[PDB]
Amino acid sequence: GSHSMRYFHTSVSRPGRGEPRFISVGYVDGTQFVRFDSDAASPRTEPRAPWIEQEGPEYWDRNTQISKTNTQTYRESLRNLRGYYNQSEAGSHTLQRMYGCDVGPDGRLLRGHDQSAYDGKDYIALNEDLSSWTAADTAAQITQRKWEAARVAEQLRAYLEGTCVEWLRRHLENGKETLQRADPPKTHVTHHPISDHEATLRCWALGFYPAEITLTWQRDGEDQTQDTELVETRPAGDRTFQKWAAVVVPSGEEQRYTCHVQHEGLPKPLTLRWEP
């Protein structure tokens, strides 16, 4: 299928408590593989998946230098943003950025990304053309003017079409035993009485990877989206994910309800009913 590599950068000011913390985490699809944290006793890029551990010293040192540099750039960014919004020196603020590439089944670039947000609001983003910017407000237009003069989009484009796609393809190969393995969900329907009149049917999906799944309840074949409690997909802790969906049904109408599960790891989409 399609694949992506993404980096998630969080920088948080903390006036009175040192300089802004900078953390970068890298993902291939749903699999975290690196971290850097300026608050570690010895900040360095560190492996967080087994397959990346075979990269050599020069990979780790190059990434560590990049993240120490990015640490300084985000701290200067945070000072500038404070000026752009006329904000006091006394408050804590957050600067986030996510960037990376998506590739198709044939390894070709599908699209690149480079988005930033300030205090939780979209601030500036590289457009899909990888050549122009969308600024959210007059503050971000100042950033846009700086980045146009410094030709940041051209340099981002080079990274995204070159390094990012090449290294995503390398990681996918080195980690193929996990990254290119879809694990299907283990599924069950549980039944939880509420009262004499109603009961909860809960459809479980456990242990699956990647996180993408469709888990739906139908009544006489009509989707029950409006009456379904669908919890957010949640990490199990072992790289896999979990999800469930529940509907409240009239007592004795259980068999009119079917749970349908679609996941890349299943040989066939699943149709589940309550088996008492």
């Binding site: 890298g26 990015n70 750039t73 960014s77 960037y99 410094a150 940041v152 981002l156 990274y159 990012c164």
Partner: peptide, 9 residues
């Protein structure tokens, strides 16, 4: 590897 972000905001 990561990208070094060419400018402060």
């Amino acid at each position: 590897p990561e990208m070094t972000f060419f400018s402060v905001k």
